[PDB]
C-alpha cells in the first residue's frame, strides 16, 4: 500500500506515488522528476491530474504518451494554487526538470518535499529563505559520513582533460559514455564540446534529449553515428565485451576506445582523490568510473538541514531497514544539537 512518507497531511496530495493504483482520497498526484522509480505506474491510461515541471511534462507526453488534458505543468519559483492550496516548485539540482515542492497548508504549516536533490548553498537564496519550514521530506540517499565526493565542476574538468589528451595523442580513438536515464548530460556534452564533435546516439535517446529545453541542443547532438566521435550507449554495454563488440560495428574507423561510467558513489572515494583516478584496461579499451553525483554528499545534506532548521524530518530513501532508519535518526539528532534548534 502507499507508504506514509509519500502522503502530504492536510491535503488530498501524494508525491511520486503512481504504482499503488487509485490512492484513496488523492485529488492531485505530484511527480518530482522523470526517473523510473518515481514515475513507475504512469501511462496513456492515467486519468488523474499530474502536477510537475514543464520539462517533466514534455517527457510524460512524448515518452509515456500521457494525454495532455491530465498534464499540469507549473512554472518554477512562482506561487501557484492547486485544489485550494498554495504550492511553489523549486530547482532541485538533480536531473533536468527535477523539482522540490513547498506546500503551504491551510492551517499555517509549511512542508518542503525535496524529491531527489543535490543540496547546494544557492538554495539558501531561493524562496526558501522567506519563511519557516516545519516539516522536511528529505532525500537521504547518501546520509552517512563515508559518502564524500568532489564537485561536479572538478569531475567535468578531469573528464575533459582526459578525453582531449587521449584523442590528441591518437586521432583514431573513439570516446564512449554510458547512460540509463536522464541526468548527467554535462559529462558527454562537455567532452564532445572540447573535441569539436556532436554526440551520437540512438533515436530513442535523441528523442528523450529533445524534451529537455537545453539551449542550442540541435548543435550538440545527432543520430548519425558515422559523423560523431563521442558515442552514447546503454550503461549495460560499458564493459570489455560490449565495447569490443561496438568497435567491430564502426568498420575500422577507430582502433582504441576510451569509455566513461558516471557512477554515483564507489568506495575508491574514501581513499582516492579525483586527480589520482585510473582506468580498467584490456588491450585497446580503457574504462573510467567517475564519481559524478546528482545527489547530496553527507556534508552538503548536513549544511542544508542545519540552515533550514526544520521541526520534523521524514526520510524518503533507505527507509526499508531498521538499522538504516535508526542510523539516520541518530545523525538528525546530532545535527540539531550541534546547531541549537
Ligand atoms: Ni532520481
| Ligand 1 center from residue 169 Cα (angstroms) | 37
| Ligand 1 center from residue 116 Cα (angstroms) | 5
Question: Are 75 and 98 in contact, with CB atoms under 8 Å apart?
Answer: no
Question: ∠ CA 20-24-28 to the nearest 5 degrees?
Answer: 85
| Ligand 1 center from residue 200 Cα (angstroms) | 24
**Could you tell me the strand order of the sheet in which 280-282 lies?**
221-222, 199-200, 230-234, 173-179, 256-262, 285-290, 280-282
User: What is the CATH code for 148-295?
Assistant: 3.40.50.12650
| Ligand 1 center from residue 97 Cα (angstroms) | 11
Question: Are 170 and 254 in contact, with CB atoms under 8 Å apart?
Answer: no
| Ligand 1 center from residue 38 Cα (angstroms) | 7
| Ligand 1 center from residue 340 Cα (angstroms) | 31
Q: How far apart are CA 325 and CA 317, in angstroms?
A: 9
323-328 long-range contacts, CB within 8 A, separation 24+: 327/143, 327/144, 328/140, 328/143
| Ligand 1 center from residue 95 Cα (angstroms) | 7
**Grid cell 558513489 in the structure block, residue:** 265
| Ligand 1 center from residue 180 Cα (angstroms) | 12
Beta bridge mates, 231: 176, 200
Query: 109: Cβ–Cβ under 8 A, 6 or more apart, which residues?
Result: 9, 10, 134, 135
Residue range(s) occupied by CATH 3.40.50.12650 in the chain: 148-295
| Ligand 1 center from residue 82 Cα (angstroms) | 24
| Ligand 1 center from residue 119 Cα (angstroms) | 14
| Ligand 1 center from residue 142 Cα (angstroms) | 13
**Grid cell 542545519 in the structure block, residue:** 306
Largest CA distance in the chain: 68
| Ligand 1 center from residue 297 Cα (angstroms) | 15
Q: How far apart are CA 50 and CA 126, in angstroms?
A: 24
| Ligand 1 center from residue 285 Cα (angstroms) | 30
| Ligand 1 center from residue 55 Cα (angstroms) | 14
| Ligand 1 center from residue 138 Cα (angstroms) | 13
| Ligand 1 center from residue 34 Cα (angstroms) | 7
Query: 132: Cβ–Cβ under 8 A, 6 or more apart, which residues?
Result: 110
Q: How far apart are CA 53 and CA 291, in angstroms?
A: 27
- Indicate if the alpha-carbon torsion angle 310, 131, 318, 302 is positive or negative: negative
- Write a three-state SS string for the chain: CCCHHHEECCCCEEECCCCCCCCCCCCEEECCCCCHHHHCCCCCCCCCCEEECHHHHHHHHHCCCCCHHHEEECCCCCCEEECCEEEEEEECCCCCCCEEEEEECCCCCEEEECCCCCCCHHHHHCHHHHCCCCEEEECCCCCCCCCCCCCHHHHHHHHHHHHHHHHHHCCCEEEEEEECCCCCHHHHHHHHHHHCCCEECCHHHHHHHHCCCCCCHHHCEECCHHHCCEEEEEHHHCCHHHHHHHHHHCCCCCCEEEEEEECCCCCCCCCCCCCCCCCEEECCEEEEEECCCCCCCHHHHHHHHHHHCCCEEEECCCCCCHHHHHHHHHHHHHHHHHHCC
Question: Are 58 and 210 in contact, with CB atoms under 8 Å apart?
Answer: no
Q: How far is CA 66 from CA 20, 71, 78, 214, 226, in A?
A: 18, 7, 25, 22, 34
52-58 long-range contacts, CB within 8 A, separation 24+: 52/97, 52/99, 53/89, 53/97, 53/98, 53/99, 54/97, 54/213, 55/96, 55/97, 55/211, 55/212, 55/213, 56/31, 56/97, 56/98, 56/99, 58/97, 58/211, 58/212, 58/213
Residue range(s) occupied by CATH 3.60.15.10 in the chain: 1-147+296-341
Chain-centroid distance of CA 7 in Å reads 22
Q: How far apart are CA 162 and CA 288, in angstroms?
A: 10
Chain-centroid distance of CA 52 in Å reads 15
| Ligand 1 center from residue 334 Cα (angstroms) | 27
Question: Are 211 and 55 in contact, with CB atoms under 8 Å apart?
Answer: yes
Query: 204: Cβ–Cβ under 8 A, 6 or more apart, which residues?
Result: none
| Ligand 1 center from residue 179 Cα (angstroms) | 13
Backbone angles phi, psi at 244, to 5 degrees: -60, -45
Task: State which approach was used to obtain the coordinates.
Answer: X-ray
Q: How far apart are CA 204 and CA 220, in angstroms?
A: 16
Q: How far apart are CA 119 and CA 153, in angstroms?
A: 15
Question: Are 94 and 115 in contact, with CB atoms under 8 Å apart?
Answer: yes
CATH 3.40.50.300 corresponds to the domain 1-147+296-341: no
Q: Which residues lie at CB < 5 A from ion ligand 1?
A: 35, 116
Q: How far apart are CA 136 and CA 142, in angstroms?
A: 16
| Ligand 1 center from residue 35 Cα (angstroms) | 5
Amino acid at each position: 500500500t502507499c507508504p506514509f512518507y509519500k502522503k502530504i497531511p492536510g491535503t488530498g496530495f501524494t508525491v511520486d506515488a503512481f504504482q499503488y493504483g487509485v490512492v484513496e482520497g488523492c485529488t492531485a498526484y505530484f511527480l518530482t522528476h522523470f526517473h523510473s522509480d518515481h514515475y513507475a505506474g504512469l501511462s496513456k491510461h492515467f486519468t488523474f491530474p499530474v502536477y510537475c515541471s514543464e520539462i517533466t511534462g514534455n517527457l510524460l507526453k512524448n515518452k509515456l504518451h500521457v494525454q495532455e488534458q491530465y498534464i499540469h505543468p507549473l512554472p518554477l519559483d512562482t506561487e501557484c494554487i492547486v485544489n485550494g492550496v498554495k504550492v511553489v516548485l523549486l530547482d532541485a539540482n538533480h536531473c533536468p526538470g527535477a523539482v522540490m515542492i513547498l506546500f503551504y497548508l491551510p492551517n499555517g504549516t509549511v512542508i518542503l518535499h525535496t524529491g531527489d536533490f543535490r543540496a547546494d548553498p544557492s538554495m539558501e537564496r531561493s524562496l526558501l529563505a522567506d519563511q519557516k519550514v516545519h516539516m522536511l521530506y528529505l532525500d537521504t540517499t547518501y546520509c552517512s559520513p563515508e559518502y564524500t565526493f568532489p564537485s561536479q565542476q572538478e569531475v567535468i574538468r578531469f573528464a575533459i582533460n582526459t578525453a582531449f589528451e587521449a584523442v590528441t595523442l591518437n586521432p583514431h580513438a573513439l570516446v564512449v559514455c554510458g547512460t540509463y536515464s536522464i541526468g548527467k548530460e554535462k559529462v558527454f556534452l562537455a567532452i564532445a564540446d572540447v573535441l569539436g564533435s556532436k554526440v551520437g546516439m540512438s533515436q530513442e535517446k535523441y528523442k528523450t534529449l529533445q524534451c529537455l529545453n537545453i539551449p542550442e541542443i540541435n548543435s550538440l547532438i545527432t543520430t548519425d553515428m558515422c559523423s560523431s566521435l563521442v558515442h552514447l550507449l546503454p550503461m549495460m554495454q560499458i564493459n570489455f565485451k560490449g565495447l569490443q563488440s561496438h568497435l567491430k560495428k564502426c568498420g575500422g574507423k577507430y582502433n582504441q576506445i576510451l569509455a566513461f561510467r558516471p557512477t554515483g558513489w564507489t568506495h575508491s572515494n574514501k581513499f582516492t582523490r579525483i586527480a589520482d583516478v585510473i582506468p580498467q584496461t584490456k588491450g585497446n579499451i580503457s574504462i573510467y568510473g567517475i564519481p559524478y553525483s546528482e545527489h547530496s554528499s553527507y556534508l552538503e545534506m548536513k549544511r542544508f538541514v542545519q540552515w533550514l532548521k526544520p521541526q520534523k524530518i521524514i526520510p524518503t530513501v533507505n527507509v526499508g531497514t531498521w538499522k538504516s532508519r535508526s542510523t539516520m535518526e541518530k545523525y538528525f539528532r546530532e545535527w540539531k544539537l550541534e546547531a541549537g534548534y
